[PDB]
JSON list of C-alpha atoms in Angstrom, two decimals:
[
{"chain": "A", "resi": 5, "resn": "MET", "atom": "CA", "xyz": [-25.26, 6.59, 32.04]},
{"chain": "A", "resi": 6, "resn": "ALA", "atom": "CA", "xyz": [-21.68, 7.73, 31.52]},
{"chain": "A", "resi": 7, "resn": "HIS", "atom": "CA", "xyz": [-21.50, 9.74, 28.31]},
{"chain": "A", "resi": 8, "resn": "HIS", "atom": "CA", "xyz": [-19.63, 13.03, 28.54]},
{"chain": "A", "resi": 9, "resn": "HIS", "atom": "CA", "xyz": [-16.68, 12.98, 30.91]},
{"chain": "A", "resi": 10, "resn": "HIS", "atom": "CA", "xyz": [-15.81, 16.65, 30.37]},
{"chain": "A", "resi": 11, "resn": "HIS", "atom": "CA", "xyz": [-12.75, 17.00, 32.61]},
{"chain": "A", "resi": 12, "resn": "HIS", "atom": "CA", "xyz": [-10.53, 18.31, 29.82]},
{"chain": "A", "resi": 13, "resn": "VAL", "atom": "CA", "xyz": [-11.99, 16.67, 26.74]},
{"chain": "A", "resi": 14, "resn": "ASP", "atom": "CA", "xyz": [-15.46, 15.43, 25.83]},
{"chain": "A", "resi": 15, "resn": "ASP", "atom": "CA", "xyz": [-17.72, 14.22, 23.03]},
{"chain": "A", "resi": 16, "resn": "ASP", "atom": "CA", "xyz": [-16.83, 15.54, 19.58]},
{"chain": "A", "resi": 17, "resn": "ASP", "atom": "CA", "xyz": [-18.13, 15.12, 16.00]},
{"chain": "A", "resi": 18, "resn": "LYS", "atom": "CA", "xyz": [-21.36, 13.57, 17.23]},
{"chain": "A", "resi": 19, "resn": "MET", "atom": "CA", "xyz": [-22.05, 15.35, 20.48]},
{"chain": "A", "resi": 20, "resn": "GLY", "atom": "CA", "xyz": [-24.45, 13.77, 22.94]},
{"chain": "A", "resi": 21, "resn": "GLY", "atom": "CA", "xyz": [-23.60, 10.32, 21.65]},
{"chain": "A", "resi": 22, "resn": "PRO", "atom": "CA", "xyz": [-21.35, 7.41, 22.65]},
{"chain": "A", "resi": 23, "resn": "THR", "atom": "CA", "xyz": [-17.67, 8.31, 22.86]},
{"chain": "A", "resi": 24, "resn": "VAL", "atom": "CA", "xyz": [-14.46, 6.57, 23.80]},
{"chain": "A", "resi": 25, "resn": "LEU", "atom": "CA", "xyz": [-11.55, 8.27, 25.52]},
{"chain": "A", "resi": 26, "resn": "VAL", "atom": "CA", "xyz": [-8.77, 7.05, 23.31]},
{"chain": "A", "resi": 27, "resn": "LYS", "atom": "CA", "xyz": [-5.64, 6.37, 25.31]},
{"chain": "A", "resi": 28, "resn": "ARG", "atom": "CA", "xyz": [-3.97, 4.21, 22.67]},
{"chain": "A", "resi": 29, "resn": "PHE", "atom": "CA", "xyz": [-4.51, 2.47, 19.34]},
{"chain": "A", "resi": 30, "resn": "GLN", "atom": "CA", "xyz": [-4.09, -1.26, 18.80]},
{"chain": "A", "resi": 31, "resn": "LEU", "atom": "CA", "xyz": [-3.60, -2.71, 15.34]},
{"chain": "A", "resi": 32, "resn": "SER", "atom": "CA", "xyz": [-4.85, -6.21, 14.64]},
{"chain": "A", "resi": 33, "resn": "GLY", "atom": "CA", "xyz": [-3.86, -8.11, 11.52]},
{"chain": "A", "resi": 34, "resn": "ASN", "atom": "CA", "xyz": [-0.98, -5.77, 10.70]},
{"chain": "A", "resi": 35, "resn": "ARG", "atom": "CA", "xyz": [2.14, -7.64, 9.61]},
{"chain": "A", "resi": 36, "resn": "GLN", "atom": "CA", "xyz": [3.69, -5.17, 7.18]},
{"chain": "A", "resi": 37, "resn": "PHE", "atom": "CA", "xyz": [3.62, -2.26, 9.61]},
{"chain": "A", "resi": 38, "resn": "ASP", "atom": "CA", "xyz": [3.82, -2.32, 13.41]},
{"chain": "A", "resi": 39, "resn": "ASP", "atom": "CA", "xyz": [1.48, -0.45, 15.78]},
{"chain": "A", "resi": 40, "resn": "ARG", "atom": "CA", "xyz": [4.02, 2.35, 16.21]},
{"chain": "A", "resi": 41, "resn": "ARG", "atom": "CA", "xyz": [4.10, 2.96, 12.45]},
{"chain": "A", "resi": 42, "resn": "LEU", "atom": "CA", "xyz": [0.31, 3.11, 12.20]},
{"chain": "A", "resi": 43, "resn": "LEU", "atom": "CA", "xyz": [-0.12, 5.06, 15.46]},
{"chain": "A", "resi": 44, "resn": "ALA", "atom": "CA", "xyz": [1.51, 8.11, 13.89]},
{"chain": "A", "resi": 45, "resn": "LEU", "atom": "CA", "xyz": [-1.47, 8.14, 11.52]},
{"chain": "A", "resi": 46, "resn": "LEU", "atom": "CA", "xyz": [-3.61, 8.74, 14.60]},
{"chain": "A", "resi": 47, "resn": "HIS", "atom": "CA", "xyz": [-0.99, 11.03, 16.18]},
{"chain": "A", "resi": 48, "resn": "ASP", "atom": "CA", "xyz": [-3.60, 13.82, 16.54]},
{"chain": "A", "resi": 49, "resn": "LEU", "atom": "CA", "xyz": [-6.45, 11.74, 17.95]},
{"chain": "A", "resi": 50, "resn": "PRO", "atom": "CA", "xyz": [-5.88, 10.18, 21.43]},
{"chain": "A", "resi": 51, "resn": "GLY", "atom": "CA", "xyz": [-6.09, 12.00, 24.72]},
{"chain": "A", "resi": 52, "resn": "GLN", "atom": "CA", "xyz": [-9.55, 13.03, 23.60]},
{"chain": "A", "resi": 53, "resn": "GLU", "atom": "CA", "xyz": [-13.01, 11.48, 23.50]},
{"chain": "A", "resi": 54, "resn": "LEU", "atom": "CA", "xyz": [-13.42, 10.28, 19.95]},
{"chain": "A", "resi": 55, "resn": "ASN", "atom": "CA", "xyz": [-16.86, 9.08, 18.91]},
{"chain": "A", "resi": 56, "resn": "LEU", "atom": "CA", "xyz": [-17.45, 5.87, 16.94]},
{"chain": "A", "resi": 57, "resn": "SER", "atom": "CA", "xyz": [-17.58, 7.81, 13.67]},
{"chain": "A", "resi": 58, "resn": "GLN", "atom": "CA", "xyz": [-14.17, 9.40, 14.35]},
{"chain": "A", "resi": 59, "resn": "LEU", "atom": "CA", "xyz": [-12.91, 6.00, 15.47]},
{"chain": "A", "resi": 60, "resn": "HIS", "atom": "CA", "xyz": [-13.86, 4.49, 12.10]},
{"chain": "A", "resi": 61, "resn": "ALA", "atom": "CA", "xyz": [-12.40, 7.52, 10.32]},
{"chain": "A", "resi": 62, "resn": "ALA", "atom": "CA", "xyz": [-9.09, 6.85, 12.07]},
{"chain": "A", "resi": 63, "resn": "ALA", "atom": "CA", "xyz": [-8.92, 3.49, 10.32]},
{"chain": "A", "resi": 64, "resn": "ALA", "atom": "CA", "xyz": [-9.41, 5.14, 6.92]},
{"chain": "A", "resi": 65, "resn": "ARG", "atom": "CA", "xyz": [-6.13, 6.98, 7.45]},
{"chain": "A", "resi": 66, "resn": "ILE", "atom": "CA", "xyz": [-4.34, 3.66, 7.72]},
{"chain": "A", "resi": 67, "resn": "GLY", "atom": "CA", "xyz": [-6.20, 2.06, 4.84]},
{"chain": "A", "resi": 68, "resn": "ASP", "atom": "CA", "xyz": [-4.89, 4.78, 2.53]},
{"chain": "A", "resi": 69, "resn": "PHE", "atom": "CA", "xyz": [-1.47, 4.66, 4.21]},
{"chain": "A", "resi": 70, "resn": "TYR", "atom": "CA", "xyz": [-0.97, 1.09, 3.03]},
{"chain": "A", "resi": 71, "resn": "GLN", "atom": "CA", "xyz": [-2.13, 2.03, -0.47]},
{"chain": "A", "resi": 72, "resn": "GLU", "atom": "CA", "xyz": [0.65, 4.61, -0.80]},
{"chain": "A", "resi": 73, "resn": "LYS", "atom": "CA", "xyz": [3.15, 1.94, 0.21]},
{"chain": "A", "resi": 74, "resn": "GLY", "atom": "CA", "xyz": [1.90, -0.20, -2.65]},
{"chain": "A", "resi": 75, "resn": "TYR", "atom": "CA", "xyz": [-0.64, -2.20, -0.67]},
{"chain": "A", "resi": 76, "resn": "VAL", "atom": "CA", "xyz": [-3.66, -1.06, -2.66]},
{"chain": "A", "resi": 77, "resn": "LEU", "atom": "CA", "xyz": [-5.55, -4.21, -1.69]},
{"chain": "A", "resi": 78, "resn": "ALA", "atom": "CA", "xyz": [-4.97, -3.37, 1.96]},
{"chain": "A", "resi": 79, "resn": "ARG", "atom": "CA", "xyz": [-7.62, -1.67, 4.07]},
{"chain": "A", "resi": 80, "resn": "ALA", "atom": "CA", "xyz": [-7.77, -0.91, 7.77]},
{"chain": "A", "resi": 81, "resn": "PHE", "atom": "CA", "xyz": [-11.17, -0.79, 9.45]},
{"chain": "A", "resi": 82, "resn": "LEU", "atom": "CA", "xyz": [-12.27, -0.38, 13.06]},
{"chain": "A", "resi": 83, "resn": "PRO", "atom": "CA", "xyz": [-14.66, -3.30, 13.75]},
{"chain": "A", "resi": 84, "resn": "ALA", "atom": "CA", "xyz": [-15.65, -1.87, 17.14]},
{"chain": "A", "resi": 85, "resn": "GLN", "atom": "CA", "xyz": [-16.94, -5.08, 18.76]},
{"chain": "A", "resi": 86, "resn": "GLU", "atom": "CA", "xyz": [-17.31, -3.36, 22.16]},
{"chain": "A", "resi": 87, "resn": "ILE", "atom": "CA", "xyz": [-14.28, -1.08, 22.19]},
{"chain": "A", "resi": 88, "resn": "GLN", "atom": "CA", "xyz": [-12.14, -0.86, 25.33]},
{"chain": "A", "resi": 89, "resn": "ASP", "atom": "CA", "xyz": [-12.45, 2.26, 27.49]},
{"chain": "A", "resi": 90, "resn": "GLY", "atom": "CA", "xyz": [-9.06, 3.48, 26.34]},
{"chain": "A", "resi": 91, "resn": "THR", "atom": "CA", "xyz": [-7.69, 1.04, 23.82]},
{"chain": "A", "resi": 92, "resn": "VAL", "atom": "CA", "xyz": [-9.22, 1.20, 20.36]},
{"chain": "A", "resi": 93, "resn": "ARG", "atom": "CA", "xyz": [-8.56, -1.68, 17.98]},
{"chain": "A", "resi": 94, "resn": "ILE", "atom": "CA", "xyz": [-8.33, -1.52, 14.21]},
{"chain": "A", "resi": 95, "resn": "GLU", "atom": "CA", "xyz": [-8.34, -4.48, 11.82]},
{"chain": "A", "resi": 96, "resn": "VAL", "atom": "CA", "xyz": [-5.72, -4.21, 9.11]},
{"chain": "A", "resi": 97, "resn": "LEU", "atom": "CA", "xyz": [-6.64, -6.26, 6.06]},
{"chain": "A", "resi": 98, "resn": "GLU", "atom": "CA", "xyz": [-3.31, -6.18, 4.24]},
{"chain": "A", "resi": 99, "resn": "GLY", "atom": "CA", "xyz": [-4.30, -9.04, 1.99]}
]
């Protein structure tokens, strides 16, 4: 079963587990900030094989991002729900 691709990048954080080669981030529910704006929060992530844990951690960056803009009630979370083999989706609960 396809786990480690290891052609330049491979499983990190939790090695030997399920990983997704992040090619791009997709934001769902975001109305205050566009994908582009939130993507810079993940600027250092894609092009690599991020594991689910790192994928969820990516969303935490955005959840705090909104808070600093005044949206303290806002939280971004990665619901997974069978993530695409390249596109990762994060749910932005702005309020």
